[PDB]
Ligand binder design. Sequence first.
Ligand code: SRM
Ligand code: SRM
Ligand code: SRM
Ligand code: SRM
Ligand code: SF4
Ligand code: SF4
Ligand code: SF4
Ligand code: SF4
Ligand code: SF4
Ligand code: SF4
Ligand code: SF4
Ligand code: SF4
Ligand SMILES: O=S([O-])[O-]
Ligand SMILES: O=S([O-])[O-]
Lengths: 417, 417, 363, 363
Amino acid sequence: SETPLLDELEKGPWPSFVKEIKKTAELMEKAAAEGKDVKMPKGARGLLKQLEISYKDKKTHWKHGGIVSVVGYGGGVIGRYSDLGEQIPEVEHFHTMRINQPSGWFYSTKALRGLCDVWEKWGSGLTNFHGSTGDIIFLGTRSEYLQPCFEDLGNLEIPFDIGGSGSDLRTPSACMGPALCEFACYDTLELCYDLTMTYQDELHRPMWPYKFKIKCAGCPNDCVASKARSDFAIIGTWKDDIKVDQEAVKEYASWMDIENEVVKLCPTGAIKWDGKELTIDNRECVRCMHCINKMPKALKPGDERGATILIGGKAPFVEGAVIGWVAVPFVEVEKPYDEIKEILEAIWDWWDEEGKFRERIGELIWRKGMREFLKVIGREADVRMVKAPRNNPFMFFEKDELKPSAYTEELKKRGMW
Amino acid sequence: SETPLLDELEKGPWPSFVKEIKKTAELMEKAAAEGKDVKMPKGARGLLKQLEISYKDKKTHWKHGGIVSVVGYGGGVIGRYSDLGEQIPEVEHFHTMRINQPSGWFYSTKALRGLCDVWEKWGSGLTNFHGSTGDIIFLGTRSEYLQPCFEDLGNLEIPFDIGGSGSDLRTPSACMGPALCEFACYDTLELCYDLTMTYQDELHRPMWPYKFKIKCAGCPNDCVASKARSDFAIIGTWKDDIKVDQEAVKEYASWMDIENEVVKLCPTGAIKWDGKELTIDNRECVRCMHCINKMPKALKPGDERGATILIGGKAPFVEGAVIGWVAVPFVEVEKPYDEIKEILEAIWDWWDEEGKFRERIGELIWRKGMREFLKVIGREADVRMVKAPRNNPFMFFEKDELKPSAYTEELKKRGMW
Amino acid sequence: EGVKTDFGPPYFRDLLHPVIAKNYGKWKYHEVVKPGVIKRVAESGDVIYVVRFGTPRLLSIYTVRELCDIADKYSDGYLRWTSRNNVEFFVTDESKIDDLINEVQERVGFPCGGTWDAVKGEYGLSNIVHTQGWIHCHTPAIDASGIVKAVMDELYEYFTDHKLPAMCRISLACCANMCGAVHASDIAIVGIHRTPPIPNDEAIRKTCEIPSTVAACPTGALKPDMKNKTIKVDVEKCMYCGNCYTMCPGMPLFDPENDGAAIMVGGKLSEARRMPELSKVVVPWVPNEPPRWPTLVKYVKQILEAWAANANKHERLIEWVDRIGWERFFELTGLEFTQHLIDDYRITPYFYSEFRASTQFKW
Amino acid sequence: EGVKTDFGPPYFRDLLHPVIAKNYGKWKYHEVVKPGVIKRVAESGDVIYVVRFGTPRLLSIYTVRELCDIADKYSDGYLRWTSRNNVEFFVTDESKIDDLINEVQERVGFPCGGTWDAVKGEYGLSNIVHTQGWIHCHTPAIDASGIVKAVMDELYEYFTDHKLPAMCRISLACCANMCGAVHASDIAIVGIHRTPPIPNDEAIRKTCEIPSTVAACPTGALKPDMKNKTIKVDVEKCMYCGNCYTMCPGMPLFDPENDGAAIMVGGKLSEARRMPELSKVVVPWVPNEPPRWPTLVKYVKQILEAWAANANKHERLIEWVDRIGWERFFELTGLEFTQHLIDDYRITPYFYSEFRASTQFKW
Ligand code: SRM
Ligand code: SRM
Ligand code: SRM
Ligand code: SRM
Ligand code: SF4
Ligand code: SF4
Ligand code: SF4
Ligand code: SF4
Ligand code: SF4
Ligand code: SF4
Ligand code: SF4
Ligand code: SF4
Ligand SMILES: O=S([O-])[O-]
Ligand SMILES: O=S([O-])[O-]
């Protein structure tokens, strides 16, 4: 009875992660006994054994690990050291490799199999599909195998590069967008790839004060959770009228309580149904999507499409958890996305110059203010950036906004200007 | 004209403060000229002259003043000194005396005539009815007249004591309450008076880190704005059912759009009208007053009355302006108000021990936490104190809340428990 | 003997009209008869009319005496003030109400009004709470009394009639100290500076306790200068709040060309229909232009008129914005949104936004 | 020649199913046929079905190989993962949908579901986003996989059917680094410590950069010790966040008996019907009880069931709270409000609550 605590977790209908680890050890060791080119066959069983001790102790058995990477890069590999390194030698080193996913996590079977072959050769055989940022996670290899593994990945027929970690541009991710979704207001997947490609250096070679994440949602439903999990959330939107098929609205009206499930749930009362015609006051509409989510055969986003950029989203450390807020109410999204890239690169230049060690962009904006942030990106303040104007009178004014006066001359005279 | 700018403000339909100042100057000067005992007959005219200059320069001509007081008190009188005191010596020292109002600003003419006679003798003749806190303001006297003015005040048939100022208990104030208002949930006037008398020492002799203000509103309409400008807002409430007279509701219904003006305006949808019977779900009611305000001949506050106490209310400095928040969801308000007094004395003892120079009670609570505050007042945390539970997991736990453990034992051994 | 102290205010019960004393806490209902006049009916059958008049707050003792003569004639020698500094008389003989009104108007020039009637849903504009301004305070950015007069002259018709669809409190703070519930008013006028202090080293050395002056700055723009036994200001961090001058005569920051008023809107104290709210800046700055402040007055009126033209019955300004949103507010009021209006007051804790700043909760 | 670098991920468009590739950005309408299966109709009239399956996120490469075998048979050698770590197949023959479901369950043991239908207003519970825990991370307070396993065994029937009246995201973080969307989920499980760090002076001298460690404490509980060349911790200021351990291996705070999970509730990411919301703590602490965590699991289920029984169609947890209030939430969920739930995290700016953390605004 090797793993009695973990064994209980193979019972039950939800697919078991313990069954995932047990299969990996059992087949990896089978491969290495069969003479397959496998460098860490004892990888998964060692992990299983450690996790069992962890369960007993009710604590982790991993410690702070060395800085370990592939040649040419500074990010993408997370070093992990076991403190049971002598009792369980096979997990003494157990590093992760973050492998950049294709946009929208779309795969061909060939692409996936290449990944499997390489990782079977060099690692534990354990993966995550996917790590939260979006990357494929290769879970557990030794320091020696990092560079040869990466060589093999980049030598594949369909090759995969390393994603981001550390104080770099993290791997961008995107909702499925136009590939499957009729709500998509721009090509999320192309945007995501183009960004990933354009900023390869910034992703591979951390040079920034801290991490930076970009996520791309095709409409306000935000299916990659960009506003909470990215510093720079590109969320699709439109500027014109919601397209209304009155015929299709009647089809819904024949079975759906439109009054209660649509009209009364509109946050702004923009949408009216009298039993004959659906009317949307698009001036009142805040494009929350509810009515479109409700009657997708009848209601479509407008034809003037782009995105709203929300800035600052992050987990709590250090200054509190952030759902991103309105930075650019509307930007066009068209290849080569020069307008978006212009914004990003200005943000990075500024952040790199002004950011403190481990200061996220959201915290930088809180520290420096929206005026400085908007000047950096060359945009003007907009009422849409706030839920409400400030509740206190303590406003900063630019020197040049002041009326020339004996007082201002005194400030200038003293070099306090 | 000597006052061409201020003369502009004698024009127009609204009663002119300029006229009040000039009337005072004219009649004080006349009284003095007639041989009446008037110490400062030129005070009002000096004030007028200073103000005209302030209008032309667009700035104050008052400076920080000295500390001045009546004998035996350290608050209630604020020194004020003119920077024009060489050009206008009659306003060089121009102090205010704050004079405690009767609860609810109820006067007999005998009472007011006494105050007029005393201030005509010792001060400028200008007053504010009333200072924002509630006191009568005697606006402008000299240091040498403060004590004799106070002795005369105390010797009137209907005598008046000094109110609060500085780092003391300020003059409490109260809405008209049951003197006139059929909404009143407790005797605002009696409580205000009893607190004022109970804490005469705390009011007259500042002993605290900063000011502390108490205001008493008879019901949640809060007709003394207690929640924005008192640290300790005592706001009438009830715990049982709203009283409903059905015949009177029907009378309203003959002419009033009850649906649109009452029912749809209830914040929680507690109150319903079907054309025959008014129903209120008092479990849903948050006692906002709107329905009772709408139908005062039909609807009354319930019979089980008391108050909610809101803590912290203050202007901006230093850490931001505060509408006070729920500290005590319900306390009984029955003479001699021992329960209220117990809370106040506990808060004061704690704040005096722990408070920094010029730290308001609201700020001290923000610094120390609600847990400490609640222990001080011997009350338990209640969900009604928040609009929402915390948006982060960064909680403190009490030592005695923890499981006994080897770690907790280590902490003891290291000397950190 | 020695001087009497610690005797407190005269006990109010002794100063009540006998009909009020008699019926104290035993009222049936009130009825707003017409602007400025409220009928109150007691359980005993007594009826008393409370007649309200606007005042300039600053009163001559001679005006107080005239009010006393009027009270002796019409309200049996009794009167009160309200919490917005209106004055009220008590009349038992209904046939005398108009005689009282005419006499007050004639003798002291105070208008009958400042009432509202929630029942019919027609509201007067009542008095503007305000404080000392250049009349008495050393820290104002704007005058109080002058602006109140200029504003009420332009809005006078709203005081004397019930012409508004909801309650609208206009309140004025002559500096950021507020000295009133100005930070929770439907329309608030708030005196601000726009220039940092210039330390006077000699004054600071002589009169300012340095650690406490430094601790008064909400942005940490002040630091002690030990070498010169004074204080240095980091002008880049200062937003001209003026608190360091409250503490320290050596830190003045007044500039007559740049001081002025912010106009804030959407505050609320009562619970009725909607929780209380702090007011919000919608005009960053208007200059002082005594004696009539036409720029400031134009904006207050522009805001009030836009709200009143568009508000439903009982819908106060914050409630109107709740309905239409800030985008529309700025459009309909004709106001420009700029970066100034984006809040950056760092020190206030987010957790305060999670506290229940309201008596509205369920049992 | 050496090694190729800076080449990026493979181009997604090359890895697309022909029907998807052909009809790219040219879709007419989707239709949720039944739990786990979504019909997608192109403007060209082409029809495809996307079939969704729960994964344990952590996959054996041999499980991925099996998924690839499945994908070759039923979905033209194409599949995707979802942003909640479910996996989706693309079926063009409706008659073959049911077969695929059976073979996925037989081969890899993955359930079909994790979908919802806003049209009818019936919702499934989808996968739980989660992190590394005791599997790979050095800063966890709870396991991830173990708890996710325990919870989803208990809540299984909500994944495979549309049993809920609105969307409910469950999410988990093993520590306060709160990796994932845990801070904005309807129900969130967050690993917390309840004990302060006991500094290891030796390890700090050798391995830690003191000033950056000190600077990482949100409460300023940390100070450099000069005459010992180490870090001192003020226990009264420490709320056991564990950030200092992230910075410095010499700052462990793990107590197996007092580490555990907080349960948070009422986050929301979407715009539909009401703005996004950050989750709120409603249960301060539950123990680690591996391998089944019955205390933790009972509360999550207790919270979910109470919400489901009372919520209107589309009414997500935060929206339900908007309607009933927190007083009624605590009563209905049978939970205790204690002082712990009163927010006291001082550093966060109030002004954040005034920023528009939402794409909802009028043009
Ligand atoms: C790889 C991944 C595991 C997972 O399954 O969650 C990961 C795991 C770790 N994260 Fe993360 N984060 C992962 C996504 C996230 C996300 C969500 C997202 O990116 O979509 C967040 C919230 C967004 C954000 O970044 O704020 C997140 C917020 C953090 C935190 C908090 C940062 C903050 O400002 O509060 C730390 C950052 C730190 O330690 O400096 C962190 C750091 C870490 C470290 C390096 C642990 C540490 O404290 O040093 C992690 C290593 C675990 C290991 O060795 O196995 N991770 N982390 C996640 C991504 C895999 C991928 O590459 O695709
Ligand atoms: C006399 C006075 C109390 C006092 O002790 O002096 C008073 C008296 C009444 N108030 Fe008040 N309130 C008085 C200041 C206030 C203030 C405090 C302030 O403005 O600083 C407010 C809080 C203002 C705010 O909410 O921002 C106040 C908010 C109310 C409310 C709420 C209206 C709303 O729709 O939000 C009611 C309900 C109503 O309209 O009938 C009200 C209703 C009343 C009633 C009708 C109560 C009753 O049953 O008689 C009284 C007659 C008012 C009228 O004109 O219809 N009283 N009332 C106050 C007169 C000020 C003045 O001269 O205008
Ligand atoms: C006289 C009065 C204004 C009036 O014309 O009615 C007044 C006038 C002054 N107030 Fe006040 N406050 C008056 C009520 C208030 C109120 C309202 C209340 O009490 O109902 C507040 C808001 C509540 C509060 O206290 O926060 C108020 C908030 C302040 C502030 C800011 C407090 C804060 O924490 O931000 C200051 C500054 C300070 O405390 O140093 C202050 C300080 C002052 C000073 C002493 C000026 C200063 O900068 O040091 C004022 C002196 C004027 C003079 O010498 O003539 N006064 N002050 C009001 C008191 C008269 C009375 O006894 O009835
Ligand atoms: C498959 C997936 C996209 C992707 O993988 O790239 C996706 C796909 C769709 N989402 Fe989503 N959403 C996906 C993540 C999300 C998540 C994001 C998350 O949880 O991290 C939520 C945001 C969570 C939140 O709001 O807190 C999300 C917010 C929505 C909203 C929810 C509206 C609401 O009631 O608040 C819409 C509207 C709806 O219900 O149709 C939506 C609807 C949709 C639609 C119906 C769009 C369409 O026209 O086809 C797609 C079908 C989902 C369904 O089952 O009905 N999707 N969607 C997502 C993967 C999740 C999964 O495996 O279950
Ligand atoms: S964010 Fe919008 S475009 Fe993307 S999958 Fe979700 S509903 Fe579709
Ligand atoms: S998208 Fe939302 S705001 Fe716009 S009309 Fe539809 S339900 Fe209303
Ligand atoms: S607070 Fe209530 S009791 Fe007091 S006057 Fe106003 S309405 Fe009447
Ligand atoms: S007092 Fe307010 S919450 Fe209660 S029923 Fe009346 S209108 Fe509704
Ligand atoms: S608000 Fe400012 S200027 Fe007006 S009295 Fe108070 S402290 Fe003085
Ligand atoms: S004016 Fe205000 S912000 Fe500027 S230095 Fe003084 S206290 Fe600080
Ligand atoms: S949430 Fe914490 S414990 Fe979990 S993977 Fe992220 S850093 Fe590690
Ligand atoms: S656990 Fe957090 S609060 Fe405690 S000392 Fe470390 S960083 Fe500071
Ligand atoms: O690894 S974390 O930084 O996403
Ligand atoms: O005088 S003020 O501080 O109330």
